[PDB]
Amino acid sequence: TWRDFGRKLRLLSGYLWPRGSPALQLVVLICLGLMGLERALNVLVPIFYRNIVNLLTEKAPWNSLAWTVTSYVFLKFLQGGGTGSTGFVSNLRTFLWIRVQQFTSRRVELLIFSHLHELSLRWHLGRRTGEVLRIADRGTSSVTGLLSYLVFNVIPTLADIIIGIIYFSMFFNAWFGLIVFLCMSLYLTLTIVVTEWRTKFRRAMNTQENATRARAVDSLLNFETVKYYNAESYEVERYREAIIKYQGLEWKSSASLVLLNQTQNLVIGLGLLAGSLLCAYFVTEQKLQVGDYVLFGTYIIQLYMPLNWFGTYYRMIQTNFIDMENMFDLLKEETEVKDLPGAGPLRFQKGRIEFENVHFSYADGRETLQDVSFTVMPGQTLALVGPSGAGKSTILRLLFRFYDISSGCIRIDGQDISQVTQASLRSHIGVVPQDTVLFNDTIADNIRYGRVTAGNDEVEAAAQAAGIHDAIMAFPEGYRTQVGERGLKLSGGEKQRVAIARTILKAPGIILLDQATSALDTSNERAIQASLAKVCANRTTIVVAHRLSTVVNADQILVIKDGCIVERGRHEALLSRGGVYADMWQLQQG
C-alpha cells in the first residue's frame, strides 16, 4: 500500500496541467517563474541582513547606510515571511492561479457528475444518498486542495532546503551543509516511521465515519415515516450513541497527530542546537565573524519556518485524502450494461416486439423470469396480469434495457436490442413508472421534460389528454406552480396524471404502462383510456394493471404467476377456458 501511494500522487498530478487551452498553458509557465523567483529571495534576504549589521559595526556614513536598509525592506516586502505565506510575489501568483484551478475544479466536477448518470440501474438502487452526494460535493475540493499544497507548499519547501544545502557548502564550509542535511534526513525518516504507525488509526476511521451518518441521513430522506410513528426521540438517541463511538475513535486519530507534531519539533530543535553551538564555536575560535552568526541565525529560522506552519494542516491533509480516495474508488466502477463497440442505431420501422425464451436473475439465487416468450404485432395492446411479485414490471425493465439478460433474445423489428446502441433504443420507447417521481420545479417543466424542445402550446394540448388540464386552472399561479421535492405537494392522483402527460409529449413508438390507474378513481380511467386509444391507434402498447376491467378490450392477455406464463390469449378465450384467469375474474365480480 506504500507503492500504490506513489501512483496516488502521480494520478493526482495529471490534474495540474491544463489540456487543450494554450491560453492557460502559459499562465502555468510563468507561475513557475514567480515560484523560481521567490527561491532567490530566500537567499538574498538574509545576505542583505548581515550587510546592514556589518555597516553598523564598521560605522558607515548615513548616506551610504540608508540605501541598503531600504534595500532590505524592499526584498522583505517581496518575500512576506517565507514560502507558504503571502508576500507580494507569493500572492501575485495566487492572483493568476485562481483562473487555472477554475479549469481543474470545473473539469473534475463535470467528470464525477457525468459518471454518476452513466452508471447502470443496479448501482443506483444499492447506493446511499448521504454517501454519494457527499463524495460528489467534497470531491472537487480535495483535488483542488491537495494541488494547492503539493505545488505551493511541499515542493517549494523541498526546493528551499536543497538550495540551503548548496548554500552553506560552497560559501561557508563543509560543516553547515552537513548539519542542515543530517537534520532534514532525520526529519524525513521520523515522519515516515510515525506515519506507518499512524495508519492503524486513520484507515479504521473512514470505514466508521460513513457508518455513523448513514442512519441519520436515512432518517431524514423519509421525514414522514419518522413523523407518523411516535419518534423524533428514538432517532436522536441512536445518533448520540453512534457519535460517541466515532468521537471516541477520532480522539485516537487527532491525538496521534500531536505525537507526530512533537517528534518533528524535537528534530528541528536538535539541528538548531547543533548548528547554533557550532557557529558560536567558530566565532570564539575566530574562524568566522560575528556578522556571519547573524546570517546563520536568521536563515535557519526561515528554513525551519514552513516546516512548523505545515504542522497546522495535518488534520485537513487527512480529510483531503479521505475525500479524494473515496472519489477514485467511485470512478473505477464500470457500467454494468455496456453497448457494443461498432454499434449502429436502432432502425425503428413498425414496432414488433418479440421475446424468445428469455431467462433472467437479479442476484443468481432465484430465476425471476423463466422461459418468457411472446410476440406483439404492431398496433396492438398486450396485457400482463398476475399477483404481486410475479415479474410483471421486470419485463418492462428488460425491454427498456436497464439489465442484461442471461440467455434468450429480445427483438424489436427483427433487431436485437443488445446489438444496437442503448441511447437509440430508449428513444422509441416511452414508459410511465409505477410510482412516479417529479423534479423540484414548475409542473409545466415536468410535463415538457419528455420532449424538451416543445412549446407551451403543445404542453397544454397533451395535458388535455391526461385529464389534468381542468384541474390546474383551478390552482393559483397557473402552470408554473410548485410540486415540492418529488411531487409531494400535489396529490396521489395529480402526481400521476403528470406522468401520463409527459409520455405523450415524447410520442414514442412503443408505449409502456407499469401503473397508470392506481391512484385514479373509476371515472378517470376511461377519460384517459379512450383518450390514449386515439394516441395508441397505430403504436405498440404494453399495459399491466391489477384491476381487470381495463384489459377487457386488449388484444392479448398474458398471465404471470411466478415468472412463468401459465396461459395466454384474448379475454373471451380465457373465460371459457376456466383457468386461473377465469377464477381471477369471478373473484372480483363477487
Next chain:
Amino acid sequence: TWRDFGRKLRLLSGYLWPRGSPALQLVVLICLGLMGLERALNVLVPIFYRNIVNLLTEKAPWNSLAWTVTSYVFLKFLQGGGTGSTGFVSNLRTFLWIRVQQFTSRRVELLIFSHLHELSLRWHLGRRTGEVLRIADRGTSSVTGLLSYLVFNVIPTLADIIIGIIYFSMFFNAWFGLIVFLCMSLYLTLTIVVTEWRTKFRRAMNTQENATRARAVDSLLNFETVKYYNAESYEVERYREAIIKYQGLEWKSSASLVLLNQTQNLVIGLGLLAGSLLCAYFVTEQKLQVGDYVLFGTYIIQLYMPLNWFGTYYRMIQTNFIDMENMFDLLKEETEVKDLPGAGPLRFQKGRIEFENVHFSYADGRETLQDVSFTVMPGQTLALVGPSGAGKSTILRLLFRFYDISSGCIRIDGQDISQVTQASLRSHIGVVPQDTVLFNDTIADNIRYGRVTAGNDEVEAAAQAAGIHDAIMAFPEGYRTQVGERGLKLSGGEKQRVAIARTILKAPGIILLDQATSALDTSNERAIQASLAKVCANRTTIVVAHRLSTVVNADQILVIKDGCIVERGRHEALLSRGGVYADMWQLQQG
C-alpha cells in the same frame, strides 16, 4: 449589518465554554494558562537572542557562552515560530483542546439534528434535500472551525501586539511604541474599509451558490426519470452552463482577496521601513547599541509573522461564515404546529372521532375543506370516496395533526386534539401512508419500527396478517434482506404489505388507511381485509379507497367532491337514493 455582526461573534462565543461538566471546565482554565505562557516566550526569545550576540561582541569565554546559547534553543523549542504555528507548548494545548471541541461538535450536531425533526410537515415538503443535508453537514465544522481561529489565532495575535506596545515603550523609548501602534492602527482601518467594499461580491455569491447545485442534486435524487427519457446529456449541459455563471462570479470574490492581501502587505512593509530606518539612525547617532538593532530586527518579524500566515486563510474564513450563517438562519425557524403550555396527555378511552364544521386551507388561496362534519362511533369503519384531488387524504392529515385548522373543532373521545400534547395524540393513531417509504436496512427492522421493543416472534406473527409472510421465505437471506433506499429493491406490492405490517405491530386505538390495496391485486385484498377485520374488531377505522368493492360492508360511506360532503350513509341507502354515489357505482359495473 455591521452592528449585527457584533452578535454573530457574541453568539458564537457561547459555544466556547463547556456547560454542566466541570471536568472539562478546568481544561479550558489551563489551556488559558498555556496560552498566557506562550505570550511570555514571545518576549523572552529575542531578548536571549541579543544576549548571544553581545557575548560574541564582547568575546565571552566558551564556558559561559554555551550555557546561554542552549538557553536560546530551548525557548525556541517551546515557541516553534510564533503563535499560530506548532511549538512544544502550542501543540500541548492542542492535545488538550481536542477533548473540548468534541463536546462542542457533539452538542451542536445533536442540536441541528433534533431541530430538523421537530419542524412541522409544511417545511419538509418545501425544502430541498441538497441544501438541507449540506448545512447539517457543514454546520458543525464552521463553529468548530471559527472557534479554533478566534481563540487560537485572532486573540493571541492581538494579545501579542499589545504586549509589543508596552514593550518598546518602557524599555527603549517613546518612539517604537508609536511606530508599531501607528502601523497596526493603519492595518485595522484598511482591513475594514476593504471588507466593506468586498461585501458587494461575497453576499451575491451565497444566493447563487445554492442555485447552481439545486438542479444537479435534484437531477440525482430521482435517477430513474433521467434514465427513462433520453437524457444524461441534457442534465450535464445545464450543469456546465450553471457552473460558468458561478465560476465567473467567484473569480470576482477570490481575486478580491488578493487586493485585500496586497493592501495589508503594503502596510506591514511601511511600518518595517519606518522602524528599520529609525533604529539605524539611533545607532548612527549612538543612542543605542548594534546589539539593540538585532533585538529589533528579530522581534518585528515575529510580530508581523502571524499577520501574513493568516492571509492564507481568508477563503476558508469566508466559507466558514457562509456555512455558519445558513445554520443560524435555519435555527430561527419555529415549529408551525405548537402544543399549548400546560398541556396534558390525551386520555384515550373508546375512540370516538368527531369533526364540527372544520375549515382548512393550505396557502389561503383556496379553501380545501369546507364544512366537513361527521361522527364515528367506536368500533365502526368509515369510508371516504370521491374523485382525485377532493380532499380525502387531507382529512387524514388533520386527524393526525400535521396541520392546524382555521376554524371548527376536532374531538377524540370528547377531547380537543389542539389542547392535548401532540406526542400523545399520535400514539393512539396508526396510519399507513399512500405511497410507502422504507428505511435503507433490513425488512425485519422496517416491520418492527412500529413498536421497537417487540421481539422477533411478534414481528413474524403480525407479518402473517399482512400476507407477506409466505413471500419472504421464498427470498434468500430470510427476514434481514435489503430493500435498498426507500424500498425500491422489493416491488410495488411487496413494498406496500410491509407498511400494513408495521401498523399492526403498533396496534393503535385508531387505524387510518390512505391507500392499502392500490398495488395489490384483487386476490390479496380480502386475504388482508378479512385479516384486518379481526384486528379492527373493536378499534376505530377510517378507510379511503378508489376501488369501490372494498367499502361495501362499511358502516358509513362519505362522498367528497371538492372538499364538501354531498351525501352520506350506508351502501344500500345511497344506491336507492340515486345520487352521485349510485352513478359512480353503475359506472364501474359496466
